[PDB]
Amino acid sequence: GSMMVLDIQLFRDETGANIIRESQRRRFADPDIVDAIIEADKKWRRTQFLTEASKKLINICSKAVGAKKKAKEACVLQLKQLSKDLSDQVAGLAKEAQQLEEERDKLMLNVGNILHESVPIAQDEETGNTVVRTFGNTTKRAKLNHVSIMERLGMMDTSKAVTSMAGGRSYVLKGGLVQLQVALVSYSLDFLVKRGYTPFYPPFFLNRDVMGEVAQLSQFDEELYQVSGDGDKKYLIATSEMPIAAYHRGRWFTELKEPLKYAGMSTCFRKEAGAHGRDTLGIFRVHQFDKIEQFVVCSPRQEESWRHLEDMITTSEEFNKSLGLPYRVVNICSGALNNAAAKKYDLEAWFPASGAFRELVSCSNCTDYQSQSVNCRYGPNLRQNVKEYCHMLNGTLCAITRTMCCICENYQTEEGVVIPDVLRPYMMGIEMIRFENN
Amino acid sequence: GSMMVLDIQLFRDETGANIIRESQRRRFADPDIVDAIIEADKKWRRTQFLTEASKKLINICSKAVGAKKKAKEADGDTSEIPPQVKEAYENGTLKGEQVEQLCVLQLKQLSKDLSDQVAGLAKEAQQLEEERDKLMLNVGNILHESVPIAQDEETGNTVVRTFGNTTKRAKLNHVSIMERLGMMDTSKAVTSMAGGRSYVLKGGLVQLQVALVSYSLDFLVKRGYTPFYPPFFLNRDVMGEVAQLSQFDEELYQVSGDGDKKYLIATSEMPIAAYHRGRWFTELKEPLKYAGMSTCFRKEAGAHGRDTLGIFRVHQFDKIEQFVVCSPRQEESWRHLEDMITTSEEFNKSLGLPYRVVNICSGALNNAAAKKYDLEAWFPASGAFRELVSCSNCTDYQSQSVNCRYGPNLRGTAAQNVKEYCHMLNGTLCAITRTMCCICENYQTEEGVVIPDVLRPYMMGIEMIRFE
Numbered sequence: 074g075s076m077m078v079l080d081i082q083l084f085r086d087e088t089g090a091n092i093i094r095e096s097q098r099r100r101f102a103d104p105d106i107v108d109a110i111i112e113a114d115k116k117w118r119r120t121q122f123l124t125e126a127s128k129k130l131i132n133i134c135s136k137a138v139g140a141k142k143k144a145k146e147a148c149v150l151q152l153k154q155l156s157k158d159l160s161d162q163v164a165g166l167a168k169e170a171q172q173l174e175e176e177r178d179k180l181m182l183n184v185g186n187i188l189h190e191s192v193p194i195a196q197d198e199e200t201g202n203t204v205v206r207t208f209g210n211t212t213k214r215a216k217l218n219h220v221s222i223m224e225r226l227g228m229m230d231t232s233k234a235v236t237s238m239a240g241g242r243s244y245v246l247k248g249g250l251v252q253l254q255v256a257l258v259s260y261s262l263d264f265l266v267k268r269g270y271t272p273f274y275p276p277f278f279l280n281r282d283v284m285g286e287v288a289q290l291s292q293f294d295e296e297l298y299q300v301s302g303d304g305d306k307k308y309l310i311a312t313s314e315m316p317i318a319a320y321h322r323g324r325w326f327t328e329l330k331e332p333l334k335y336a337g338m339s340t341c342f343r344k345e346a347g348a349h350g351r352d353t354l355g356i357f358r359v360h361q362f363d364k365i366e367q368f369v370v371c372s373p374r375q376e377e378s379w380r381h382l383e384d385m386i387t388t389s390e391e392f393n394k395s396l397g398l399p400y401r402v403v404n405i406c407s408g409a410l411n412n413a414a415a416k417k418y419d420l421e422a423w424f425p426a427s428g429a430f431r432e433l434v435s436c437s438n439c440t441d442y443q444s445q446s447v448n449c450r451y452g453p454n455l456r457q458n459v460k461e462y463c464h465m466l467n468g469t470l471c472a473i474t475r476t477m478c479c480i481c482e483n484y485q486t487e488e489g490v491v492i493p494d495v496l497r498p499y500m501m502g503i504e505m506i507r508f509e510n511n
Numbered sequence: 512g513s514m515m516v517l518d519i520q521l522f523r524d525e526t527g528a529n530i531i532r533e534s535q536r537r538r539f540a541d542p543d544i545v546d547a548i549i550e551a552d553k554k555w556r557r558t559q560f561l562t563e564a565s566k567k568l569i570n571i572c573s574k575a576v577g578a579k580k581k582a583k584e585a586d587g588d589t590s591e592i593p594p595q596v597k598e599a600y601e602n603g604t605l606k607g608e609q610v611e612q613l614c615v616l617q618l619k620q621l622s623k624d625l626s627d628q629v630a631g632l633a634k635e636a637q638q639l640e641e642e643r644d645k646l647m648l649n650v651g652n653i654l655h656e657s658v659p660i661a662q663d664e665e666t667g668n669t670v671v672r673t674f675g676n677t678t679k680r681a682k683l684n685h686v687s688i689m690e691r692l693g694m695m696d697t698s699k700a701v702t703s704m705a706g707g708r709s710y711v712l713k714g715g716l717v718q719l720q721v722a723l724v725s726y727s728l729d730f731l732v733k734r735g736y737t738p739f740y741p742p743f744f745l746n747r748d749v750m751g752e753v754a755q756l757s758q759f760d761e762e763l764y765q766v767s768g769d770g771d772k773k774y775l776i777a778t779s780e781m782p783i784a785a786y787h788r789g790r791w792f793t794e795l796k797e798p799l800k801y802a803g804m805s806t807c808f809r810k811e812a813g814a815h816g817r818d819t820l821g822i823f824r825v826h827q828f829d830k831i832e833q834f835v836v837c838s839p840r841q842e843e844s845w846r847h848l849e850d851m852i853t854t855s856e857e858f859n860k861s862l863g864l865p866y867r868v869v870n871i872c873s874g875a876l877n878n879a880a881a882k883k884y885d886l887e888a889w890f891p892a893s894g895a896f897r898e899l900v901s902c903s904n905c906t907d908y909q910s911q912s913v914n915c916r917y918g919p920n921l922r923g924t925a926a927q928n929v930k931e932y933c934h935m936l937n938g939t940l941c942a943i944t945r946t947m948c949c950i951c952e953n954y955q956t957e958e959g960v961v962i963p964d965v966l967r968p969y970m971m972g973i974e975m976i977r978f979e
């Protein structure tokens with residue numbers, strides 16, 4: 074059943090419907106769908122209006138019979154029949170209500186979050202993404218790519234010894250690379266703790282019902298493994314953003330003078346159904362990887378979320394600067410944005426052997442898209458004419474395997490890989506991991 | 512289906528079969544079963560004897576036809592196979608010299624009939640092989656001579672060694688401490704999201720978790736172990752070489768959606784063992800020592816509502832594991848077992864945790880283990896010793912199942928009277944959530960939990976995590 078889509082409230086006002094139509098056109102999506110959603114919703118509201126009315130009339134029938142029969146009268150027989158009929162009508166109204174919600178929500182799958190005014194308008198990323206900032210020597214060239222380096226270290230196995238055990242794109246890390254992996258986890262966690270984030274270690278399973286509130290329906294198809302055996306069926310998490318968002322379901326923050334900031338720490342599991350033969354090379358694109366994630370829950374007011382988005386990307390930049398990895402920050406074009414995001418920044422690191430900018434980090438302001446889906450409310454209650462929801466953002470701090478790949482290319486020498494200065498105290502003071510002699 | 516059970520070769524020797532029957536009796540397990548396993552294997556070897564005879568006869572048929580056609584011999588009167596010929600190949604006594612008396616039409620029919628026999632024999636072979644290993648599910652590794660002989664743990668285990676003050680008492684148990692810290696959520700906010708026994712850790716407890724992972728890994732690196740980060744999925748075929756059928760029912764989650772069905776690992780021992788499948792170490796002058804690092808996933812199907820509370824027994828937890836592959840000769844694996852339990856002891860001493868070491872009795876040993884030591888840490892608020900660590904010598908039980916051979920591997924070697932396999936051992940260094948529970952009880956004060964000295968540099972120098 075459950076699925077994550079845009080708030081219905083914005084559709085029920087002429088000005089809001091026009092905001093959504095405009096955002097649809099700017100995303101290269103269908104604006105005509107907004108009318109279809111308003112109509113389905115108008116029918117749905119009608120069923121709810123009749124249901125609330127008829128329920129009140131069911132008590133009228135009950136109280137009437139209670140007063141009449143206490144008065145010792147032999148119309149009661151009619152009132153009883155009318156109670157059964159209204160209960161029948163309410164039952165019929167509910168089945169119709171259900172069908173209409175299903176139709177509405179399925180139409181809404183095609184409606185994205187309202188674009189920020191700064192999002193570039195383009196359908197294609199190569200031409201369409203706008204470069205915001207660059208850091209370091211982004212034209213640097215180096216000898217060996219990350220796959221060759223990790224193979225020459227003797228510290229990564231992606232051969233049939235592993236894939237015949239664990240399937241395609243599975244890998245073993247050994248020795249110095251595991252030390253580096255752990256160094257990055259711990260350094261990444263500390264980096265965020267120092268910036269006011271609360272560490273958060275989630276369950277790696279979510280139930281279907283809950284996963285449906287924080288995942289787009291296409292993610293079930295392309296990205297989420299199903300887990301079974303123990304009670305209800307579950308899904309492995311693709312990112313700690315899922316359980317962190319789900320953790321706020323049904324919550325209500327009367328105010329958030331300070332944001333909630335979490336440093337999500339987890340293994341991430343991705344089926345990568347789309348990537349038939351994209352990579353297959355190294356640990357750059359794998360089904361299982363550690364990631365440290367920024368997650369922010371904040372007030373929906375005064376565009377505070379937009380300020381946090383800037384802080385979050387700046388945080389990921391400062392992290393990569395600390396590692397000395399060259400990069401560019403790009404503002405993702407409207408055609409490439411997922412539905413939840415109102416704006417997205419990617420930090421794409423320069424891979425000097427490979428000769429390419431490759432995404433290490435994405436940071437998104439999802440405003441009230443997830444929040445309305447998980448029902449994470451904000452402010453005072455209606456009983457204020459609008460229901461307010463918290464804003465939520467999420468952004469990579471460090472995706473560990475891709476960052477390891479970038480470090481290997483950028484810090485290679487003839488003898489091995491130099492460990493970035495900041496990571497050394499997190500791996501026993503090791504200055505370099507060395508190639509197998511030949 | 513794929514299955515981890517004892518090696519067959521020792522069953523086919525009278526002295527070997529008796530050693531196995533004796534070990535079974537000493538485990539309070541079934542010896543009578545060995546006769547049933549020998550019989551199932553006898554049936555199996557018969558299908559191989561016939562298969563090899565018939566495969567050779569098929570080649571003789573082809574060569575005979577070739578020679579007859581070359582000489583322009585007439586094809587013959589009939590393709591009908593003499594009943595004695597059918598009887599002979601069904602019994603494995605048909606000789607090539609007799610086959611060569613047949614005409615071309617007969618040789619052709621016989622080649623087809625022998626091919627059908629070879630196909631029927633492959634199916635018989637596998638129903639017999641499944642029936643056999645299933646009977647083998649109940650047969651344990653040969654006990655080391657020092658294993659206490661008893662059925663029940665609570666009385667049969669032998670306390671070997673103790674460390675620290677194991678009678679001190681403390682006020683709050685680990686559940687109450689982690690609650691008062693505000694850093695562990697096991698409420699419906701979490702369980703309605705992720706199911707029973709699910710948890711969220713926050714704040715200082717995540718810092719402590721990471722500190723333990725990194726300190727544990729460093730602890731083993733300093734002792735010559737190679738870090739090993741595995742895939743957390745194993746496919747059915749491979750999982751069955753390193754697990755018994757009962758673990759599929761009680762312990763292993765199934766994962767699907769992409770490729771064939773896989774299982775989540777319950778310990779890094781599984782993928783590390785599997786990684787050695789089909790290997791052949793001609794010599795291991797030094798052992799291979801691995802420091803396994805992984806999340807472990809356990810259904811806990813048996814422990815339905817056994818513990819329930821806190822993070823002591825959960826479905827998902829980090830663990831750092833010792834895994835050793837070594838020579839099967841000169842009782843070397845027994846020396847490694849002693850070093851491994853000592854390493855886990857020194858780790859706990861370094862954390863300042865009191866404990867006892869117990870030698871696990873014969874009746875309570877799992878099948879793969881020839882001997883097992885557990886380290887049970889003292890939980891002063893619970894008032895009990897609770898298992899933190901197990902270390903076992905599985906000698907060649909996993910290695911035979913995964914086919915990890917030892918010894919010279921040279922051309923010209925025929926049917927080897929004794930195939931040798933490596934020995935494998937495994938032992939917990941640190942199960943992270945249980946160690947956190949132990950630390951919380953032992954290091955509690957009025958204001959919170961004091962961080963053990965050795966972990967402080969691994970969590971930004973923090974000396975204490977404070978109650979809300």
Ligand SMILES: Nc1ncnc2c1ncn2[C@@H]1O[C@H](COP(=O)(O)OP(=O)(O)OP(=O)(O)O)[C@@H](O)[C@H]1O
Pocket residue numbers: 312343345356357358359360362364417432433434435469472474475
């Ligand atoms: N299959 C993978 N293997 C290793 N790292 C990955 C993989 N998928 C994503 N990452 C890392 O996680 C970061 C965040 O990825 P995200 O959750 O945004 O998924 P995505 O499909 O890349 O979506 P987006 O288009 O927003 O980046 C990426 O920038 C990358 O560093």
Ligand SMILES: Nc1ncnc2c1ncn2[C@@H]1O[C@H](COP(=O)(O)OP(=O)(O)OP(=O)(O)O)[C@@H](O)[C@H]1O
Pocket residue numbers: 778809811822823824825826827828830877885898899900901939942944945
């Ligand atoms: N469900 C669990 N939750 C948290 N920690 C666990 C769990 N199961 C095992 N552990 C930890 O892992 C360690 C090793 O566990 P092991 O794999 O040996 O499983 P076991 O069946 O509980 O123990 P044994 O080996 O004695 O049968 C235990 O000593 C304990 O510290």
Ligand code: NA
Pocket residue numbers: 210211212213
């Ligand atoms: Na340049």
